[PDB]
Design a protein around this nucleic acid. Structure first.
Lengths: 101, 43
RNA sequence: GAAGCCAGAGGAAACUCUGGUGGAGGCUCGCAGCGGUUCUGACGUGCAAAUCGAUCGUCAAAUCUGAGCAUGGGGGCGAAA
RNA sequence: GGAGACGACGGCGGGGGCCCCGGGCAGAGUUCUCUUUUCUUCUUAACGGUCUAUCACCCUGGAAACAGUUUGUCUGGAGAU
RNA sequence: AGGGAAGUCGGCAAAAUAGAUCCGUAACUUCGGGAAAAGGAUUGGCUCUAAGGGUUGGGCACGUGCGUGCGGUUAACAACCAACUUAGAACUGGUACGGACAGGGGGAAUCUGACUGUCUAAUUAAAACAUAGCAUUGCG
RNA sequence: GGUAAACGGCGGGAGUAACUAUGACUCUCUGUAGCCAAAUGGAUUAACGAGAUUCCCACUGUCCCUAUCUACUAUCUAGCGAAACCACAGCCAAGGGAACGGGCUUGGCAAAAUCAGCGGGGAAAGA
RNA sequence: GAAGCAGAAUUCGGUAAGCGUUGGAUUGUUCACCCACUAAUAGGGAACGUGAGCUGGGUUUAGACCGUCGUGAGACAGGUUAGUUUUACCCUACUGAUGAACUCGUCGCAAUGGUAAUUCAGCUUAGUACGAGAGGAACCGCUGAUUCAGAUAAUUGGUUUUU
RNA sequence: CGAAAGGGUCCUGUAAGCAGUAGAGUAGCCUUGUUGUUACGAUCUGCUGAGGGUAAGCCCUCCUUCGCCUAGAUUUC
């Protein structure tokens, strides 16, 4: 279940987007910027156990290995395999392009 | 932080409750649960 | 998940540890029942000379309850207000 | 001398009834498509006869290399298997 | 919407939590508890896999379906029958997966009464009363 | 005479000449975690609580700051149909010695008959 | 209006109530003082010369505990806890809504009553006047914002029995 | 004027049904595997921005249809 599903769509309850997840997977600098926007001592497991695919911190290595068997992690894997939706795909959907000369 | 993780004084997301642990430590210090005294000046 | 019991590993023995079994308690969550905590509650010539809603306490017993019978005002009865 | 004649609680086993599943006769419904389909009746009293059913008891025999045995460790030279 | 107790005497009210599987669980303690402490991971459908059962049934030599005297523990095998749990895996929809219903908010402390219990029917349910324990007095 | 020594009184400790109660008369009094006790040195007492209190996280219309939707009313109609209360009545201002005016004096003013609301006043609390 | 008032910022005083005068913390307490924002966070009356709007303290029926006093019933120097008043449909006032008589209707007038806006900032003037220096204005002109008031739903949010 | 209809404009999100060398796997019949085959099977793909709704306080329609009409009663210097 979802904790406090009534206010799930509030901006203060927002979660990291899938295109950001792909960019974190592709380049470690973008992931490092996202991690520098956080505080290490206030994270589960002091930030040592992180799932990039779910964009989620975990209290222990066995907890990370545990959620990997779950279906939300597999949903994130299949969504990343399909590919997230970007502005390039948005322009290709309407047949629009960029002319740089 | 170590005392909070040892005693389970955790917030949402495993964050240690240093506020509550500090209040507990201060109360223990006042209420005769931690040994402390001021030594008398030597003559 | 108390005694009692079985098996294994030890221990000179008494005992120790581990895995089960077992099903105790004026123990506990909670349905009915019994009760009556709270709400700027409803109602206030009310459905009602004490009712209604939600919430709450208890729920294997110092639990709930019928009929028969006993105690009668200078009295009775009273876990005593 | 027995019966009348006796608490509360826990799990276990037997029986009746109810619930559930399958086949068959008959009836009813559904049927654009599907569904050899869905549903309904198919019962047997008191009173008796007969054959049987845990506990327990009797006979033979005498058990350690102890045995029988319950979900629950009780039984046995005071005679077990 | 945004903020999140700035409201109010006072978080009153509402919201949030809630079933189940798994990981994990501090101080204190009368060692029994605290404890569902705290803090985390997951839950739909479909197609499969695996595990957990019951009944029946042994070869000769004689007498004649049983009686013996033997011989054997691979029945570790066949035939028939049957129900519900548990674990594992792939595939697949998704904003929701205890999808309605149902259903603990949690924590740090202090005062207070040991606890379970009882009373002012119709304004007070409580530190009041009772309770087990303890102490005293009287009576052969 | 002895005490449940219960209530109560009760600053001690020495002496003496009193000699028993009451004495009386002088004197003077200020270990940064140990030792000792049958592990512990406790009431800073666990569990339990519709008991009272402070705070933290979460949470939210408590608030900024209100808006919107539903049902039942209120509303209008048909039928049915009370009660409370009621000296008489009801617009104000200033004065009306007894710190009170609704009625008097002097002014402002002032136009039929009505409906929905409201809680200033009058009425309204088994007041 | 006055002041060594250079400028800037002020101080003392006068006319003036038109228009504003805030948000919070703190109850081991006469809840009054702190904090910030701001142009500023002025003071009072209409109650307190007794007095039915709501709701907390003085505050106090009946239950209960502690302290002081009392032989006691109980009382208090006191401290704490929990605890029953529940209209409106009447008259008036107020806010809105109809309306008889003047044939019906259209277009008007305006007695009288009400009346509304407010404050700050920025650009320019200008780094100018003034000034040893540090610093540092104003009139006219231009643009926004604060508080108030009256509307409106193109857009953006919210609301969904469009069931 | 009214009731339908048509077109538009909006709302949702791709109908029912059929088919498919899509589909994890399972089970039969035989060529015993060579999409072997047939059967079932969440879902997927196509027909299909399709289906459904649309004023109830949306718009247009002499020229898309069907009805309705010069009343009745009461009052009036």
């Amino acid at each position: 279940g979802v904790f406090a599903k009534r206010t799930m769509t509030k901006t203060r309850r927002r979660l990291r987007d899938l295109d950001q997840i792909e960019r974190d997977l592709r380049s470690p600098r973008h992931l490092q910027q996202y991690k520098e926007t956080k505080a290490a001592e206030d994270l589960p497991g002091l930030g040592l156990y992180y799932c990039i695919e779910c964009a989620k911190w975990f209290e222990s290595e066995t907890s990370l290995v545990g959620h990997r068997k779950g279906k939300p992690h597999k949903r994130r894997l299949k969504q990343l395999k399909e590919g997230a939706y970007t502005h390039e795909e948005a322009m290709a959907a309407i047949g629009y392009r960029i002319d740089n000369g | 932080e170590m005392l909070a993780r040892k005693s389970g004084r955790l917030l949402k997301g495993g964050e240690p409750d240093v506020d509550g642990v500090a209040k507990q430590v201060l109360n223990d210090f006042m209420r005769g649960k931690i040994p402390w005294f001021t030594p008398a000046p030597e003559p």
